[PDB]
Design an enzyme around this catalytic site. Structure first.
Site, PDB file in Angstrom:
ATOM      1  N   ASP A  37     -61.664  31.563  23.560  1.00  0.00           N
ATOM      2  CA  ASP A  37     -61.706  33.016  23.617  1.00  0.00           C
ATOM      3  C   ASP A  37     -62.953  33.622  22.957  1.00  0.00           C
ATOM      4  OD1 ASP A  37     -60.984  35.739  23.817  1.00  0.00           O
ATOM      5  OD2 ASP A  37     -59.398  35.603  22.311  1.00  0.00           O
ATOM      6  N   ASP A 233     -66.067  38.160  27.877  1.00  0.00           N
ATOM      7  CA  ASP A 233     -64.807  37.697  27.313  1.00  0.00           C
ATOM      8  C   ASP A 233     -64.078  36.645  28.139  1.00  0.00           C
ATOM      9  OD1 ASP A 233     -62.437  37.451  25.873  1.00  0.00           O
ATOM     10  OD2 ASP A 233     -61.684  39.463  26.331  1.00  0.00           O
TER      11      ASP A 233
HETATM   12  C1  LIG Z   1     -58.906  33.896  31.030  1.00  0.00           C
HETATM   13  C2  LIG Z   1     -57.751  34.143  30.175  1.00  0.00           C
HETATM   14  C3  LIG Z   1     -56.785  34.308  29.481  1.00  0.00           C
HETATM   15  C4  LIG Z   1     -55.655  34.508  28.636  1.00  0.00           C
HETATM   16  C5  LIG Z   1     -54.384  34.118  29.003  1.00  0.00           C
HETATM   17  N1  LIG Z   1     -53.302  34.309  28.225  1.00  0.00           N
HETATM   18  C6  LIG Z   1     -53.506  34.916  27.047  1.00  0.00           C
HETATM   19  C7  LIG Z   1     -54.734  35.366  26.597  1.00  0.00           C
HETATM   20  C8  LIG Z   1     -54.884  36.119  25.371  1.00  0.00           C
HETATM   21  C9  LIG Z   1     -53.947  36.739  24.569  1.00  0.00           C
HETATM   22  C10 LIG Z   1     -54.480  37.479  23.476  1.00  0.00           C
HETATM   23 CL1  LIG Z   1     -53.475  38.335  22.368  1.00  0.00          CL
HETATM   24  C11 LIG Z   1     -55.867  37.448  23.453  1.00  0.00           C
HETATM   25  C12 LIG Z   1     -56.848  38.087  22.511  1.00  0.00           C
HETATM   26  C13 LIG Z   1     -56.759  37.423  21.149  1.00  0.00           C
HETATM   27  C14 LIG Z   1     -56.597  39.567  22.298  1.00  0.00           C
HETATM   28  S1  LIG Z   1     -56.770  40.472  23.810  1.00  0.00           S
HETATM   29  O1  LIG Z   1     -57.206  41.817  23.479  1.00  0.00           O
HETATM   30  O2  LIG Z   1     -55.604  40.255  24.639  1.00  0.00           O
HETATM   31  N2  LIG Z   1     -58.090  39.659  24.573  1.00  0.00           N
HETATM   32  C15 LIG Z   1     -58.434  40.233  25.893  1.00  0.00           C
HETATM   33  C16 LIG Z   1     -58.829  38.580  23.991  1.00  0.00           C
HETATM   34  N3  LIG Z   1     -59.958  38.216  24.501  1.00  0.00           N
HETATM   35  N4  LIG Z   1     -58.252  37.979  22.894  1.00  0.00           N
HETATM   36  S2  LIG Z   1     -56.442  36.497  24.769  1.00  0.00           S
HETATM   37  C17 LIG Z   1     -55.813  35.150  27.429  1.00  0.00           C
END
Ligand SMILES: CC#Cc1cncc(-c2cc(Cl)c([C@]3(C)CS(=O)(=O)N(C)C(=N)N3)s2)c1
EC number: 3.4.23.46
Length: 388
Positions: A37, A233
């Protein structure tokens, strides 16, 4: 030539569920699958039983576990987690041959964070300390890795979309791509790498200076494209656009694909559209070009994606089905997985820049390909960046 053979093909997953890398935490090593991530800065792992986890970090079984005696609560709209901070020894089996002492947020409670069938048990936040939780004093993993070893301050991602749905067993057996830690593997891309500056070190922030739909200029004030920021991202599935940009882009995409009418639910990214096996009319959908600020003054370059990138393959039958993977945002532009799947992306932290090259694994047809091209002469590009 490809100089990082041990890290090539070390990723698994897909745009809808995320791309993950294998990691080990503790002594003796505990193996976990970890979401890659670039949109967050915490290394957080499941550390207690959960219905959607088949394994988790067991701190009591690690002789090198150090308790930081501090809790952390991280709520997002996409999922929330509560954790206990500590440190341990961490390795990436298909990564550099190093062991790091890094911060770990041991997830004890969560709400819609772990997803049923994803195959990952934690998240590797690769962005900067500014957005780490609880605050910037919690050193992110990549910062610890660079500080403790001779690994150069750079990583590169090749996210590989299959171009078709992958079932439960196929997604576990398939190669989802590559995360090259400390370098650039030249076998993962074609053509040249073009660099855009990292505007500020928090998220991987960039500046978009022009948008085209099949060469037609969206013609909005470029500040609208970066309102209130534009980020790269790997933890976001879609290409997400600010409300006004999304409304203009969808209008233009509908006009370009007007020989076929799609339901409102399709454009809302909620409903799938299907075509008879092998008949997806790729040609009726337009290409999308994002022009990014160059490294040289008054110079820009463009990255071009195909509908094979922004139409996400989903299972329905022998029909080929997709969801529209472009959506509205109230937090600025997000260049998610479906965009990254067209390109080899170099996160050059050492030189505060992001590189783009056409991916050796992007999905295309015999008539069109994704592209990374330049230079273009672009004036007042600093004016495209949003302030406040
Ligand atoms: C390609 C793919 C994918 C994928 C699939 N399942 C779950 C996630 C995530 C959950 C969360 Cl909680 C995430 C955070 C930490 C916060 S957020 O704001 O939701 N975000 C957009 C981010 N970059 N980081 S990623 C990502």
């Amino acid at each position: 030539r490809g100089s990082f053979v041990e890290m090539v093909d070390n990723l698994r997953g897909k745009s809808g569920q995320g791309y993950y890398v294998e990691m080990t935490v503790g002594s003796p090593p505990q193996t976990l699958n970890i979401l890659v991530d670039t949109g967050s800065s915490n290394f957080a792992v499941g550390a207690a039983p959960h219905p959607f986890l088949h394994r988790y970090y067991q701190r009591q079984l690690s002789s090198t576990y150090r308790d930081l005696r501090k809790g952390v609560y991280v709520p997002y709209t996409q999922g929330k987690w509560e954790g206990e901070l500590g440190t341990d020894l961490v390795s990436i089996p298909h990564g550099p041959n190093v062991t790091v002492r890094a911060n770990i947020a041991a997830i004890t409670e969560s709400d819609k964070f772990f997803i049923n069938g994803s195959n990952w048990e934690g998240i590797l936040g690769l962005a900067y300390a500014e957005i780490a939780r609880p605050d910037d004093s919690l050193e992110p993993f990549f910062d610890s890795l660079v500080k403790q070893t001779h690994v150069p301050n750079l990583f590169s991602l090749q996210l590989c979309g299959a171009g078709f749905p992958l079932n439960q067993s196929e997604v576990l057996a398939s190669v989802g791509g590559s995360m090259i830690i400390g370098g650039i593997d030249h076998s993962l891309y074609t053509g040249s790498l073009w660099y855009t500056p990292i505007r500020r070190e928090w998220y991987y922030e960039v500046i978009i200076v022009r948008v085209e739909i099949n060469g037609q200029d969206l013609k909005m004030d470029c500040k609208e494209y970066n309102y209130d920021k534009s980020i790269v991202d790997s933890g976001t599935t879609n290409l997400r656009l600010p409300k006004k940009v999304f409304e203009a882009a969808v209008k233009s995409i509908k006009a370009a694909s007007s020989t076929e009418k799609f339901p409102d639910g399709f454009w809302l990214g909620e409903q799938l559209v299907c075509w008879q096996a092998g008949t997806t009319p790729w040609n009726i959908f337009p290409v999308i070009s994002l022009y990014l600020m160059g490294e040289v003054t008054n110079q820009s370059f463009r990255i071009t994606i195909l509908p094979q990138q922004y139409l996400r393959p989903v299972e329905d039958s022998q029909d080929d089905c997709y969801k529209f993977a472009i959506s509205q945002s109230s937090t600025g532009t997000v260049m998610g997985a479906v965009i990254m799947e067209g390109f080899y992306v170099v996160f050059d932290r050492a030189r505060k820049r992001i590189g783009f090259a056409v991916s050796a694994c992007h999905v295309h047809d015999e008539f069109r390909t994704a592209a990374v091209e330049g230079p273009f002469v672009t004036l007042d590009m600093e004016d495209c960046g949003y302030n406040i």
